[PDB]
Amino acid sequence: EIKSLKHEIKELRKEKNDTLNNYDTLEEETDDLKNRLQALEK
């Protein structure tokens, strides 16, 4: 039953990797809007 628990933990890791991909696209959007902020300020 330990292998099933490890598989469930790997599924949780996959879900968190999906959240990390969401974080990465959020980060690229943040970089784009930071460039926009710097362009509109200067």
């Binding site: 809007l33 926009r36 902020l37 509109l40 300020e41």
Partner: peptide, 7 residues
């Protein structure tokens, strides 16, 4: 950004 597009 909105501020920089509000003024």
């Amino acid at each position: 950004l909105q501020a920089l597009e509000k003024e």
